[PDB]
């Protein structure tokens, strides 16, 4: 069983931006990385894949072996592109307006995944917690595994130490993962519309209403997700230009300091 988890901030950012995308439902994804031994068994998570949940509902969070096949294919692709030994090592989901701790169903699912390999670890992000009494906001995250109880079945939780490795700059893999969220939302809306059109024998004014609903939904998606994401990327480009200028100034200053000194 795993003894520690290191998460690249590069991927923690993708997880956090995925968690804050929506409060109306719980969202999920998978974590790719490597197993390592040092000083102790550790899991280094490098990148994540965002996933679409079909069944939805409260507390009913599972990933299909189809999603596992897609994720393992992406893992092999990234392992060959990056030369890293990347396998699917974990999973994460969001608990909005809900305590960060796992439910007995979360733990049973973690155990069902450990049946694949006891080296599998779970993550949970507790998002926007509202408390007008304190008038403060809060956001938490935790890592966990499961153990068979002393008594029949009834698995129990166990905590895993998790740290964030300071990845000073953005990897391209995380940008290519973050831009998949708008694509997945648009694809979800499109699949809903396509399944709506299956009963072709339907009222025309009703089809206009459903088209208007589809347009309003994608307008909301662009106003709340794609638009702010694009604004963030432009702001980051401006920040990087200013930072490049400052670092060039500092490089010239240190070059002068070492040339004139000794």
């Amino acid at each position: 069983a795993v003894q520690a988890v290191h998460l690249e901030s590069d991927a923690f950012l993708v997880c956090l931006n995925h968690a804050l995308s929506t409060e109306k439902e719980e969202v999920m994804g998978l974590c790719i990385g490597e197993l390592n031994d040092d000083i102790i068994r550790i899991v280094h998570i490098h990148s994540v894949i965002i996933l679409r949940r079909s069944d939805k509902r409260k507390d009913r969070v599972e990933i299909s072996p189809e999603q596992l096949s897609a994720a393992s294919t992406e893992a092999e692709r990234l392992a060959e592109l990056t030369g890293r030994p990347m396998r699917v090592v974990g999973w994460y989901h969001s608990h909005p307006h809900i305590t960060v701790w796992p439910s007995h169903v979360d733990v049973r699912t973690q155990a069902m995944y450990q049946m694949m390999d006891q080296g599998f670890v779970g993550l949970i992000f507790s998002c926007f917690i509202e408390d007008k009494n304190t008038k403060t906001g809060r956001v938490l995250y935790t890592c966990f595994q499961s153990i068979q109880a002393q008594k029949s079945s009834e698995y129990e939780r166990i905590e895993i130490p998790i740290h964030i490795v300071p990845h000073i700059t953005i990897g391209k893999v995380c940008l290519e993962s973050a831009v998949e969220l708008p694509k997945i939302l648009c694809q979800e809306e499109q699949d809903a519309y396509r399944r709506i059109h299956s009963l072709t024998h339907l009222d025309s004014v009703t089809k206009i209403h459903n088209g208007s609903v589809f347009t309003k939904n994608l307008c909301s998606q662009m106003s709340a997700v794609s638009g702010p994401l694009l604004q963030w990327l432009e702001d980051r480009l401006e920040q990087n230009q200013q930072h490049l200028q400052e670092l060039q100034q500092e490089k010239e200053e240190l070059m002068e300091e070492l040339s004139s000194l000794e």
Partner: protein
């Protein structure tokens, strides 16, 4: 009776959290956006209220200050260059500033209060806000972390907390899609809907609005791909230049680093000061064989302290 809601985007909070997690220390920066005054469009209520006003503060971008005390001293005095510096960080409108303090109570510090007041003075914006984040680790096991954030604003000289909300897709997307046909046995209704269907329902099925919006979304998605490429290239340049600067800093500190008795002094000074002239010869050395004294020269010059009475 006035409220002052604070507003963010999920991505902005994510970016601040990321900038912090990359910094192995406290960090800080400025919050840029726009402030809009709206009159609370009362719900329920009566014509016997004092209708509240909401100063909604929309945070759009942040500018991180890469070193502490970049724009203030030990006493929170701002100094003039600070103004120039925040202008060099070419900007549109300032609205607040943020700070990350790892493991600290959610209450603004001595320096933070003085600094917020001085910034409100120097920027001529007496409606600034202070975003204080404290990340912390729970249970000692480092299995669970907690990021607690709050907004502060001055009112009665004292600073009070301000509500903060993060905009997300969940805010009333309200998917509808009516199923089950609204079928009518109306000849006139069917005739009219059918006549005017061609006007935007398109030919060979489909609907024109669906395709217009899909094309717009695909255009925005390709825009995102292009901006992703350009941001990736900027990140590569930043990585290279930062590694160069850090190597030169290592060389600088290394070059600067490499470029640069157990006797009773107090007893001897006290003994010499208590017997000036007379016998004087009294010292702390004696012959091991017979009980005759050996002289010692001592320091005789050290600065004495606590010279006190021998007997009252």
């Amino acid at each position: 009776g006035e409220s002052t809601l604070g507003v963010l985007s999920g991505f902005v909070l994510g970016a601040l959290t990321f900038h912090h997690l990359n910094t192995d220390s406290d960090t800080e920066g400025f919050l840029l956006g726009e402030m809009k005054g709206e009159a609370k469009n009362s719900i329920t209520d009566s014509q016997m209220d004092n209708v509240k006003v909401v100063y909604t503060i929309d945070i759009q971008k942040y500018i991180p200050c890469y070193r502490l005390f970049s724009f203030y001293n030990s006493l929170g005095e701002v100094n003039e260059h600070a103004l120039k510096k925040v202008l060099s960080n070419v900007r549109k409108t300032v609205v607040g500033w943020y700070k990350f303090r790892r493991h600290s109570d959610q209450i603004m510090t001595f320096r933070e209060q003085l600094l917020h007041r001085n910034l409100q003075t120097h920027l001529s914006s007496p409606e600034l806000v202070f975003l204080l984040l404290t990340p912390s680790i729970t249970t000692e096991s480092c299995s669970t972390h907690c990021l607690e954030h709050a907004l502060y604003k001055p009112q009665r000289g004292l600073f009070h907390r301000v509500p903060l909300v993060v905009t997300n897709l969940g805010m009333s997307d309200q998917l509808g899609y009516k199923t089950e046909p609204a079928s009518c046995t109306s000849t006139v209704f069917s005739r009219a809907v059918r006549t005017h269907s061609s006007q935007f329902f398109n030919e060979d099925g489909s609907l024109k609005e669906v395709h217009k919006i899909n094309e717009m979304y695909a255009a925005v998605q390709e825009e995102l791909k292009s901006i992703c490429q350009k941001v990736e290239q900027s990140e590569r340049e930043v990585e290279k230049l930062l590694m160069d600067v850090n190597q030169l800093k290592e060389v600088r500190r290394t070059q600067q680093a490499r470029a640069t008795p157990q006797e009773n002094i107090l007893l001897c000074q006290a003994l010499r000061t208590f017997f000036p002239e007379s016998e004087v010869l009294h010292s702390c050395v004696i012959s091991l064989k017979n009980r005759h004294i050996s002289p010692s020269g001592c320091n005789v010059n050290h600065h004495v302290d606590v010279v006190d009475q021998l007997t009252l």
